[PDB]
């Protein structure tokens, strides 16, 4: 009954940038928590960042503190992920997830995913 739509690129230069736009539809994105989960080939899932919907604070991981930024829009329910300073160690499958902060620890449901290549 609830689905997710993602978009973006498929190949990025190792040192350039890419426009990632997760386009949700019919969500309670006012008090929900939407973030990105990377899936590197050969290993499991890893947490990238998090965007709070209650206050608006954006949290990053340990190795992506000064190379990632997120812009959340509430007019058309879309998110922008401007990835900068990319190298050959960022090969992963990105997933646009959404959960409820006042619930369990695991996400509710994910999307279809987007594949990017940086080498």
């Amino acid at each position: 009954e609830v689905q997710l739509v993602e978009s973006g690129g498929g190949l990025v230069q190792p040192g350039g940038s890419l426009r990632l736009s997760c386009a949700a539809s019919d969500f309670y994105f006012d008090y929900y928590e939407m973030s990105w989960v990377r899936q590197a080939p050969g290993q499991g899932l890893e947490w990238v960042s998090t965007i709070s919907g209650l206050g608006g604070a954006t949290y990053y991981a340990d190795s992506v503190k000064g190379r990632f930024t997120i812009s959340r829009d509430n007019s058309k329910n879309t998110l922008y992920l401007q990835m900068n300073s990319l190298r050959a160690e960022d090969t992963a499958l990105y997933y646009c997830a959404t959960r409820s902060p006042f619930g369990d620890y695991a996400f509710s449901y994910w999307g279809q995913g987007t594949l990017v290549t940086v080498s």
């Binding site: 928590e33 998090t50 709070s52 902060p101 006042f102």
Partner: peptide
Amino acid sequence: LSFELLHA
């Protein structure tokens, strides 16, 4: 007091 839990 809303207690927001996160993966952070």
